């Protein structure tokens, strides 16, 4: 079994650092539940622990995601089919990615079935869910664990599984997947298969996390800082030939532009271009051309 589930909480008041959610989940016998929070903060783990506490190990809850490709009708149809411990629990993941018209229909389905099934909407934004669904639900914020806790639990995992990783390795593991304990644990697991347990250096983490090294970002800014278009072509060609996706380059380039000492006008222009390039890439545009364009804008902004 994967480590993302082998080390899940088995009880409600057991390890979940969030206190005001584990207290109410005892009285959960406001008909429905609504969890929201950043990804990988024990959203599904907590309700699964609550369901294994309430129902029991053999009494086994339909979990499906509301972001299906097959429309919304099949979702509510499956809920109806599952409808027929005086109730059953259905879990809706990514419930914020439902359009308002699809939440209206899920509202009708969940309010006509409000006698035998309890719902749990798991999302990352409570504002995306419309006011009927939230008004029928009881909200619960899930805040990520503190950085030190993250490293603590990761060391606990690495000692329970005998994975020889440096402490700076753990620091970089939690830094490379920011505040995402699920992602950090999955990386720790899938980065020890990649070595056979001999040694897990930060290069393996940087490769698995898909993070382009900060050297290449500094090279991109060194080229666009002052130089002809040939340097931009060269650095972009080298960055594409390395395999690094353009999404990661745009992400890290934005992260560097925002929290540096560029002017407000320059930051504004560069970030507008970053957003446009990000949409262009999300629309299937070609990475080389979009990166060339973005670098041309950044160059005409910095060089001036």
């Amino acid at each position: 079994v994967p480590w993302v589930e082998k080390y899940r909480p088995k009880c409600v008041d057991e390890v979940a650092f969030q206190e005001e959610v584990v207290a109410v989940l005892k009285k959960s016998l406001e008909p429905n539940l609504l969890f929201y929070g950043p990804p990988g903060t024990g959203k599904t783990s907590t309700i699964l622990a609550a369901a294994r506490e309430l129902f029991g190990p053999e009494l086994f809850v339909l979990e499906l995601n509301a972001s299906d490709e097959r429309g919304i009708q099949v979702v509510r149809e499956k809920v109806k089919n599952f409808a027929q411990p005086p109730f059953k629990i259905v879990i809706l993941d990514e419930a914020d990615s439902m359009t308002s018209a699809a939440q209206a229909a899920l509202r009708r389905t969940m309010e006509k079935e409000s006698k035998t099934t309890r719902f749990c909407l798991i999302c990352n934004y409570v504002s995306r869910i419309i006011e009927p669904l939230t008004s029928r639900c009881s909200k619960f914020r899930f805040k990520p664990l503190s950085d030190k806790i993250q490293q603590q639990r990761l060391l606990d995992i690495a000692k329970k599984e005998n994975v020889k990783i440096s402490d700076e390795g753990i620091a970089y593991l939690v830094k490379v997947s920011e505040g995402d304990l699920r992602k950090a644990i999955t990386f720790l697991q899938s980065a020890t298969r990649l070595t056979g347990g001999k040694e897990i250096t930060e290069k393996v983490i940087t490769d698995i996390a898909g993070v382009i090294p900060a050297e290449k970002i500094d090279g991109v800014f060194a080229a666009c800082q002052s130089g002809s278009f040939d340097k931009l072509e060269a650095v972009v060609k080298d960055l594409i030939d390395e395999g690094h996706a353009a999404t990661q380059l745009v992400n890290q380039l934005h992260d560097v532009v925002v929290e540096n000492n560029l002017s407000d006008k320059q930051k504004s222009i560069i970030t507008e271009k970053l957003a446009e390039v990000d949409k262009c890439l999300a629309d299937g545009a070609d990475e080389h051309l979009q990166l060339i364009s973005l670098c041309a804008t950044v160059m005409q902004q910095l060089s001036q």
Partner: protein
Amino acid sequence: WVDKYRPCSLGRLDYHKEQAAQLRNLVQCGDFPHLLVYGPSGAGKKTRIMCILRELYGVGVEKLRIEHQTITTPSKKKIEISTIASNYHLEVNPSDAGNSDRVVIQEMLKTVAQSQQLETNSQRDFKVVLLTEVDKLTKDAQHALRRTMEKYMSTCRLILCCNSTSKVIPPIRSRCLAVRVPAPSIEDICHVLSTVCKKEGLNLPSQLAHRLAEKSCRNLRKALLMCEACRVQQYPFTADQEIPETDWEVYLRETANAIVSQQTPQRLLEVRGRLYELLTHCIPPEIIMKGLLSELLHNCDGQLKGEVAQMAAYYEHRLQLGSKAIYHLEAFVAKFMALYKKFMED
């Protein structure tokens, strides 16, 4: 001989040897995960995939066949796809079904999952469903892929062979081990060329192999083809060979030079004819745009290159939204003519 010297075992790879040892350790440990292998074209993604399969199952993964399955759209427009299959895996490209890529994924995953339930005992308890060219799947299809990847996780593993994962939904990137296959260095290409020619017993010199590498632009398949094609014409290998390039490279280059020469509508019509001759041979419009833009930038001024780069990026973006690529290609050309003439004249 491109298919005659490609290695077949992970210990036989020519470059990225640390990654090779890592992949060998991966297939050696239990619970082989879903792999997402990516990297620029012609870097060795398929070679590494075939080596992973040779390490995963027996050598019986080479005795493959070619199955022709038919899918049915949400209407009577029936489509036929080509699945290269072996006794332990299945390699389908679920993108030839232009916008019906959501049903092929579901059905193929289902069929492989049910065939693995028929006494799969050779060495593993799962099959491999290699989907090539994944970054061009529609979002409604990548969502189905995400769903049916866990729905049948226990019986079939997926290896997504894309490049530049930028257009892969994070729901998938979060469920696949990301294997990144960079393009081999110039020296790596030179060494593999020298090795191939020495196994061939040829006299590949040290100044021609480097020209082949620099012209191939980190593409190993292009370099091997260029080496094979400079032999079919002039066996003795000297320092200044006229190493050939493919037909469409030349065509696209002369088309760009023609755009640069004249700036008249009578020239724009001939450029439209050239773009039609290029599209008809089924070369992607993104390749046309990048190859045209390069040779164009070679013939502009440093002050104009910014506008031309942004124009190419803009037009290419829009082309990925419409249906008739010739419209946007000709628009880009017309715009570049109207800009370049106004720049040169003034």
